[model samples]
Target chain A: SKVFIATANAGKAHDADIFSVSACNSFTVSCSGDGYLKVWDNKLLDNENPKDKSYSHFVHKSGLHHVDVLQAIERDAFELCLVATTSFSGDLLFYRITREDETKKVIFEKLDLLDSDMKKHSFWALKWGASNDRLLSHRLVATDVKGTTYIWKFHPFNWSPTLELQGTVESPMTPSQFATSVDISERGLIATGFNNGTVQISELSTLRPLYNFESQHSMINNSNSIRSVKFSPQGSLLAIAHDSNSFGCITLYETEFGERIGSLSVPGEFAHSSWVMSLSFNDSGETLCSAGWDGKLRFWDVKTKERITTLNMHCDDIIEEDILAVDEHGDSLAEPGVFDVKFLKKGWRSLNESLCCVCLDRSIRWFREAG
Target chain B: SSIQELYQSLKEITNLFEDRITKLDFKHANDIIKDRFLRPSNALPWSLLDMVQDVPDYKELLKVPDPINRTSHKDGQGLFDIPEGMNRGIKPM
Candidate 1:
């Protein structure tokens, strides 16, 4: 009875690397390059196995091309229980999820697709327009590859683009500056991380650009690309994860005046062992996980600004030499590693806080409070 | 009291670390460790490997068109069901 054990493990759930795993009310969903937005009923934690005692539940899927990666899947279970996933073609798809059905199951029925009129480029980052103080679903913001960002608000008849901050129409296939990552804060603030290691903070309600700053690796010729941007609770600080000289780094900046508060790193420095792919913070925002692309997962006490501990991932013996494989695209990690870690809020199903780890080799794990 | 009544006959034992530790000494440790390991007050922070269990032969149970529920879903169910007709075969792109 450790603190958290994989109470449920969906083996190779997504046919490919998982992009994101999120939990809503009674449902936990994950998306991947395998062209599926899969949902699992959290009640499955009670160990529902169809005779085999293996929790293999594939609750839903939406058709997207295998090549069309669903980069992100976000769920707002509070007001509308709406789920949004950004398509590879600069489009956004929303799914309205249902409560646990009579048989105690969850299903995400596909809602509407916001196909951008200005087609071609893909939307790299997306965030639902939200704030803790107001009614969400009034807005959803998405950024396309060519740099234009689309904002949507539903009045009734149509849910088309309400505003577009156009960035291009021509052959800027990859711009020197791109909003590669974005996050919305609890206080209705929007933060965008750019391709050239810059961060932008804007007003969520006003939808106007505000503070702009640079990462430590900014404009350093090598394109210190930003990967993930997250807002601490209450929008007090923005944690931007991006690349450095050759390592991954995350820096926290104050939201009010846009001053660099500090960077979360391993004990002293603000860099990871390799490129970092994502960052997840707890509700208090005091703890942070700097999940790396190279299988190194480091946790930092955002309050102390130092390493709490390094989870020794891939802690297994290599019995076979043939497992060594590498690709130009970093798919083949010799062994095991984690990509992203999300902590579920205290939920109806579980007594204590829970979490889901989207791991390497296509597995989604559910860890919950100890028995 | 003369401490075990003239304790000069105290038994002697070879030791590697300490006194031939009292039988209750290890029991005390086991009891403490059991509670700590089973229902720890502090979380086992974040190592995923120690926290993971190998799922045995996890057959990927996902297939398109939802095998059983393929056409079982209501054609015109909710306000958003879009009913399975009117050439809603699939989108062109």
Candidate 2:
């Protein structure tokens, strides 16, 4: 399928950090470093010509590092939309999106705020537990810079801690290594990626280690951090992206056997020039979408181990104007880094199969199949 | 350092890192799985096998096999024999 572009200026002075699209493809919620979280109407973007002001609500002083929206669950009478958000400033906020019965107006209300003893640590990654059969309850997994993972169970009105997972054994000098990213599989498997180039997969209920890989990336120039980790739809394969300066930063592993399925980077292949940032697997798990600090997005065929297409995200006319404006002052400009990438899901299906990315240029770009 | 020299240095460092990682050891924690199954009274809320039987839509979507009847087994070994105190998991509908 050909791809079309939908660019929207998020109106953030700083770069956007994280974003999540709803499963129904009804709306999108994004957070930025400028201390604001904004919601956009995704249905409007389906038009041939969409407006720049598709934002619905703007919440100030709610700057977050990561945000995720769980699939809508039909309860007794109405649908409940749960959102989990975290920040480096030690704010762990969970909200619910509901619609008024009579007015049909949507309202965003804070449901719970997790208190971590007022300590300031970056909540680097947060994800809802896999939305399969085991996703009956509201379960969330979040990682902090202190190498600790917190799992919470959400009741109707409040939430309680179910478990806490610690990444590394504490040492005298190095207390803990940061956990950069986390993902949960359909069969209750949890994968955590650490800043020290370590990847660990464990059982969700028992916290038992299933597989552990140490120094999975090249630790050159001390840039061996794991940026993102994602399990395929069927929980068969796990893909990991690294923050290394090496050529091959993305690696895949067979979940059942825990065997390395070769690296995605090869000579003369379309690969990221710098550190890879984010990764997303399509619904069928046959294709992978990746974005990096090099300001390019690449789609890869998983079975053939070949790159399908590479799109320079920063080459658009609007981005080009920003680059030229900075160059007029004889100042060098760095390519904007992409922070997150996700596929938009329609209902329980992935028929339309659109992709969105949050970039450092204070914008969110959408890619849809074109005619 | 020049760009080319920096690349050369990183290449050497990565080689050494790979060698160190290759020599690392990993221990599997099989006891944890055993502990979960030992306590039969404390049944898991959602067993992986039970999930396939409860949700008909999932069976149609994922193309799973129809669950066998409870009487198909001799004593307590049937594929549909849900353990006592166990609850059916998510109902997406």
Candidate 3:
């Protein structure tokens, strides 16, 4: 099975493009200047040295600016897929995969409700609630062109939204001031990342403010935007990626007191040169995957702040390869740069499931646990 | 892995974000976001009439005896008394 990577470029702000590849082997990538999204089957050779693996699937319109697959949903029986795009006129469009034609080989689609007339509003991030046994109450949350966010309910049978929410007043209202990148939470409430250094919380029912915090990093700009925001599976800790610091730090806090408990900064010189853009947590909440705009991706042990694996998908400057592998004592090792990272689910039903990411040049890659 | 962990992680991240906003020193006094929080204290319960008329300074008006509280008295000779029997056909009851 191929791992999926959704990417967007600097030129088009209103569309979402998609690409996919395998984690255990080689994959391919397809890109277009005016395309909304593309599916790429990343390639690799087996030990026998024969180039045989390749796959591709383009499933959405060319203008998808944000693409998120619902994680909590049972994908086998019924999978809730969502794609959000911004039109040239600034209208936000949402689509759902309604039917998969068996014989015709076509995935039928439907448009959900449109966002408000906030023309310039574009969706930059998409996240579904944590996977839990009781998945009845939680819904999918999305962050827009503006730093604002919304939570919507997903119905298995229809291509419509059951409920919607606007973010708290503490959330930024304009894109220039703040742009949202990701939203994830285990509980019914939502955690949103914005362009500014601030992260804000809101209740799913009332959309009211719960709490918020800013970065103390000196280099962080007033617009110290957050590119990614992730919560531990337990919902006890949160990791945010900031643009100002190539090696953005992960801040852990007390859920009850909102007190800062501990923080882990990128150690020594293993930091990415560009802004940290993506972050994800494992089911145990012990491992974290982070990526930077410099096209580097690294995984860290959340508690020890130690680098585990380095996979460079995009070919950029190799100067940071040594810095990436330097141990606490500042020793150098070889490593690769990955821009985005995801941890795949485990088990027989999800054997095809794999952690995935996209690179700066629009390559999608994946990592699988070795047998 | 546990339900509690999921709840805790979500709450902590949201709380950290909320703390940042609460700590901000608003540059504008007219900022509306100032009063917003997850939950807030509402106004105390008191009626408008009770708040306005129950003070000690209003006793002088009570002595003047407005129509609702005052009455006149008359003697058998059709003569009205001054301060001695100011009540006219009306007893203090």
Candidate 4:
């Protein structure tokens, strides 16, 4: 289509699965449902004219799904690029963008989970460590369809499982049968949320159980499923986003013992009237950004405990406004809803800056500050 | 220029208050007047106006000048003279 010639094009869509903004202000987004892995020159959006954008592309012939990107920092050298993608057949792909220019070539590697019967798990989430510094080795964590978890490391740059953590034997409450989302902190703390309204936390390095918490509401009556889990900067608190009655609530827990220190229900005024898909904390941990089936990206003040702002990050032209809605009664689901959200660097500058959001439509929208 | 100088001069005065006002009691209040404005001549009409103008608006009501000579028990009648005790009463010339 002629969409590529416009100021904004189909390239910006692709479910914009995950995003990373480098120190150089270059934006890298991992997109899904696209036949090829593409890298866009986001500098076009900053230009006065959309056509002024100069872009470089990286092509992947296989269908790329569930992509995640991270930047590796080196001493006295250019930061390295790490991108993870899942194939339609459940194969995990890893690509390192060694050199980017007119002709973009990705030093590619494929990570196959199914080779060892890992495909039965169906990978859902992939995330790298906090930083790519020389002192620390880079690691990635992925969740499977059946609640299984895997961790891999790349030092000389190859996919290898450093550790494996499985489900709990006797849980006080039956945890979700499926792992919906997973997040690992800089300190190597892994937290996974599941469909059964349960959140599990483990040490990333050891894959040892640290703590687990159960939700008061069930995924059926309350429509409360563990959609996303994140650890605070100091690893003192764990933030879990759950849904019930099409409303989302973020619960904070003591990371030391997984004891529920405080529970904050998403106020009616702050709750997304749809299922919340993804949640991310800025580098400084000052603010948290979340996206939901409502097609809105909402920012919350972690200290004051207030919803600071909300942006309609999903594309307006989409025929169905609530594409990601889930019925609490467990009847039917809306058009494939927003599965994940990534806050690009451009959005993390300050709490008041405009936020950019990625949705299932495979599109990324830059929402301006509300006047 | 005048406003800038006033702010600069107030910095030194504030430092003095910080150093001298060990306790926020009436004794400190009295000492502030004695150290900053003990001389009767220093409370002249022109000097009083200058002080009033220099005081930031935040302290406008509280910083009213009282030109009453307690020793003589006689109050000077001037545009800048305020009643000694009546908080907002300005003395008539």
All candidates: CA RMSD (Å): 30.7, 20.7, 24.5, 26.2
User: lDDT ranking from best to worst?
Assistant: 2, 1, 4, 3
Model 2's chain A TM-score stands at 0.81
Cα lDDT, model 1, residue A298: 68
| DockQ, computed on Cα atoms, for candidate 4 | 0.01
DockQ of the candidate models in sequence = 0.00, 0.01, 0.01, 0.01
lDDT head-to-head 1 vs 2, winner: 2
What's the true lDDT of residue A371 in model 1? 57
Collision pairs in model 2? A2-A370
* Model 2 misplaced regions, further than 4 Å: A1-24, A45-62, A100-105, A113-122, A157-175, A216-221, A246-248, A266-270, A318-335, A347-351, B1-93
Per-residue lDDT tens digits of candidate 1, residues A1-371? 12444565555455556777666555666766545666665655365531222222222232222111121223442224566665433345666555554754444565544444543345556665543347533555666554555655543222332233422222122544566776667677777776777677776566677787876544356458888888887457778888886677788888888898876665345557777877888666777777786676566777778776565444222223222244336665554666777777676334676777666756666655565
lDDT of 2 by residue, B19-87 (tens): 112554771457777666554644345565577566545666786579788793223454454445666
Q: Which residue pairs show collisions in model 1?
A: A90-A123
Label model 2 with its docking quality class: incorrect
A203-264 per-residue lDDT for model 4 (tens digits): 66556786767875552553667877887775476788887665766766777765776544
Residues B1-45, candidate 4, lDDT per residue (tens digit)? 653344333223210001122564759899888867664653356
User: For model 3, how does the per-residue alpha-carbon lDDT over A258-321 read when each residue is reduced to its tens digit?
Assistant: 6766655553433456566567776677777777655566667777766776555533322222
| Model 3 chain A worst lDDT window (10 residues) | A6-15
